[model samples]
Target: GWEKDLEEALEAGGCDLETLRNIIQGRPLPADLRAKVWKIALNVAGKGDSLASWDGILDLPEQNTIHKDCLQFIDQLSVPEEKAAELLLDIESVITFYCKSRNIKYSTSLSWIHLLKPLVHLQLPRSDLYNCFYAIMNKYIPRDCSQKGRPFHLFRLLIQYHEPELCSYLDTKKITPDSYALNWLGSLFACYCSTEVTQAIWDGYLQQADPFFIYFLMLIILVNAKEVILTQESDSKEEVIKFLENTPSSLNIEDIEDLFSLAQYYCSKTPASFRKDNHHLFGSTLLGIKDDDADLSQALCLAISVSEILQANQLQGEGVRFFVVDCRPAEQYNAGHLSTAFHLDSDLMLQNPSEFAQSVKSLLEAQKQSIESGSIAGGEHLCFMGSGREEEDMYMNMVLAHFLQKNKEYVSIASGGFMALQQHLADINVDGPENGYGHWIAST
Candidate 1:
């Protein structure tokens, strides 16, 4: 009876708006029949003649923008060059005509290309693809984040609100959520993931008719990768970039279903943000950590403190690694410095900042390799020490510490530097060669 009803409705020349909305919202429908229904409901299939016959002088500027995106997207098709160009013309003309009529800006974005490419690959009815593309662009392009060229703001906000510990770790590692999530959100992971996986994700999006679900999916991804991200000893943005590049390889239908369930559970528990604005469009269910009246002076103070090195050394492996850094002249360091401390000459840094940064990154990478190779029990804590020169050494240590904080590494000042550490040992009545200067502590 229901089949006959659907067929009769189609024969009568289209479903009503309510029925179409239900279908778009994931109502069950035969796959073969759905495309036809969509074209009818979208009301674009019959309008092709009007767009195709436009012989009046065209606006070169708008046409140029549309044509550029068409060429970029066509290169991605597996079809022959000639066929791809024809298909590009078909889609581009429709989009250009729509933009002209609606007064929407005729601008170019990789996102527009990404959105259409998949529909083309799947061989959806042209009218259905064109209408769907318009709907998606109309909904998202006007948002504040997208307008500012940061469409992944919702992805970032989720981590900040629900995963504070992970957020802090990323903060220290210098991994801004937006930077890694840029292409993923802008292209809807189409550029990164397999066709099957991308199509699977799109099914979910079409059913919900809301983009917020992608943010939920990202939350699941971030939560699951917590271990890989946290235990990574490399405090470099390059390493983080590598992680983002490889993330899509691990996604699948089984994982997506499980994470989908968890995502719904997680979102249900987060308190909603009730700001009287368009926040809900982006699915801003959680309020920001800072209030409107909050004092930033109190917020800006986020420095980590340190004491004598001996105190830190004694607590080694008590669930944290106590790394000691020697930040003095190489000659002085080699002559006599704390035991087990890594060398990262501060004066050398002043000579060449880029090389100094590279060297430090390499050391961290080596430490990571050792841990992964099982040469070390664990690699966790990170601390820096200097020569106790108030202006020269300590200032250098602070600057270095600040830089490493981008890797989300918890850095301490090593307050008294190597000299403070030597004094602490002497005060404790410890005896050693060179007045215990070279016998600070041992690395694990």
Candidate 2:
């Protein structure tokens, strides 16, 4: 009987009370669209205010109270940590306004974490198995970390490793200007996914706990689904562009792509402003890692490339002054050197600005000699390197580059640093010089 009623509603036109009632009563709808609508109803119909109060529900305004009630009721259902947090925040905001209208004193707003944390810990989404240990670190890492060059690259790699599903989705191939799907993934699908569907996923999330893997889950879902509502007949670039300019909803997805792309763009050549913004975003935390094979190789390659650039671009044959800063101990430098490369240990740089300046001044002096002799150009290209360049390594290079970049000078990091160089040498049948008695290369 309910199935018969559902068919009747669909045949009559579109979703309405009869359609919703039949569907809720286990009747079939005309299409996924109506089912989606019914889902929205199910998600919002009786949900409660999950913030900090119980009676706050009764205070909701009658005009919008049904939806608000649905949201509050849905919050009680289980869901993923990240999804749950996403839903809770949405529900809290929608209901808060209703309560405000009715003169009800509602509890403080629910945070992204308050809802998702429960979900993350319970359901343990696919993201958690691989990233549980690093979840907290990922949370704290700033979105703008790419401003520090290689550190930023590493940050993305870390994300890729932790959430392959999300990365794959975000990077999926699409027609030029296909952005609807892109935008959804970028903002945790806040604008897309009907309020009800979004709320349902989120409800399961709160029940699950541990929003740790929420970002990753959001990433995967957003990438896989294409949200383009227009077909070729209705949309084209010119049309889309005009629509975007005039409409709030049209082409909103493209805006999301811009945000994600901006991060990757800056990561390759992190500018000063990018770094400043990055520090602000992350709240400034230091991270570390052992000098591994990839680290060493990248550093060595960058150094070699810089050397080659200096050779090709240097006026005639005069050499360039190079600096490699390491926060590691002084003994580390004495143990080895890059032929004529100058070593500015971070300790001394912090302790003796004058001496450090003088040494740098000497590099300038060398540059002038090469410039005058027609052996090299007047430009000086300096470089810095070390572990976790965002922390100690980055600051050191930033100092040198900041002071030196304008005066026909350039600065960059050695990427993987000394270890990278030594590994390359070892690969070529050259042995790393033994340091500290029998051991080679001490830790920082």
Candidate 3:
């Protein structure tokens, strides 16, 4: 529809910025139109000369830096290595040209590598790609006549006005917005998210051109992980930061799209005037539950408490078989473990699912033999302990229990595993010692 109009306008000389903006903000344009519109917005599409003008060689001072960063680009592209190298040189040319033309600082960060990926993939003119990036930064994060200091003031405003909660959370953690949001803003979330997700955001950005959308993406990630972010545990800050930093890598195609939809929904409700303009991009209905809000399965509910295991061990002579399984690595297991605990390292179990199943079967058969030979008694039960890695430990335990339920009784996780157990042992000094089993004992 608008594609023909855009083509005609560009052919005349240059596409009208008003027309380009209108098409971009329209959301989910066809493939051909999207490429054409992107080229026009970047001022690359209208030229009558060769569409590929970069010559696949960089001549700037940052040539070596750009070349090295480009070589490190990680993606699933099936292009020949030689073509990939050519693409790198082209990218370096654009970055260098734009920086020199506009007096912008040269950055060899991997962020640029990601930003150039979609452009190269679309085969847009290298000259126009540089023009587009320069305009984007200049418009969104303008520099003074002197062009000093970083261009993150706009990002600060977005968070301050649109996402006060996120700002407050960062404040609570003693982390500044620059700590994480800088990479997101500067790179347009290029390296922060998966390729599919980055491209999706770029598509949306091309339409709306609202830099505020980047903040929306970040807020959705934080909101989805609010539990981990807001937890009052000792290492909560580091844990929260780690999750935020690694979130981009952890997401898959479905998750990226789902989160994008979710972000749009949240942005649609914001009081900002920009939200009114772009509300059409997002749906009214919230997509899916936040990650932690999902229901836990019945198998996940099968966990053993530390107190129960301690009490069970005291009455051990009653012909009950109690096995406390430690699922951490051999080194962690050796550091300290439950006195009667048996090791069934989850690392080994997870590396090969088939091997895990085989190991479980063999262990069960051995236990069965022990019971039959009067070496160990009947009514076998299991307790799984994970060293602060409760979820991974519990998941492995669930898998094993699912496979061996017919042969054994279900026990609980040590809750916090060794960390919780260690804490309980500390509480014993304050709460006084119990008469039996001594004071919350663990073994080395």
Candidate with maximal lDDT: 1
Per-residue lDDT for 106-218 in model 3, tens only? Answer: 66542555566666666666555666665565543323212222233333333433444555566556765455555565566676666666766677666656645666777
* Residue range 396-419, candidate 2, lDDT tens digits: 444544443332223455545566
TM-score per model over all chains? 0.52, 0.28, 0.49
**Which order, best to worst by TM-score?**
1, 3, 2
Q: Which candidate is the best by TM-score?
A: 1
| Count of residue pairs whose backbone atoms collide, per candidate | 10, 35, 6
Write model 1 residue lDDT over 80-118, tens digit each, in one string. 765676687667766776767665566664455666665
Any residue pairs clashing in model 1, and if so which? 172-405, 172-406, 172-407, 172-408, 173-406, 173-407, 173-408, 174-406, 174-407, 273-285
Lowest lDDT block of 10, candidate 2: 127-136
Candidate 1 Cα errors over 4 Å, as ranges: 1-31, 34-69, 80-82, 94-109, 122-127, 140-142, 145-151, 274-444
Query: lDDT value for candidate 2?
Result: 0.38
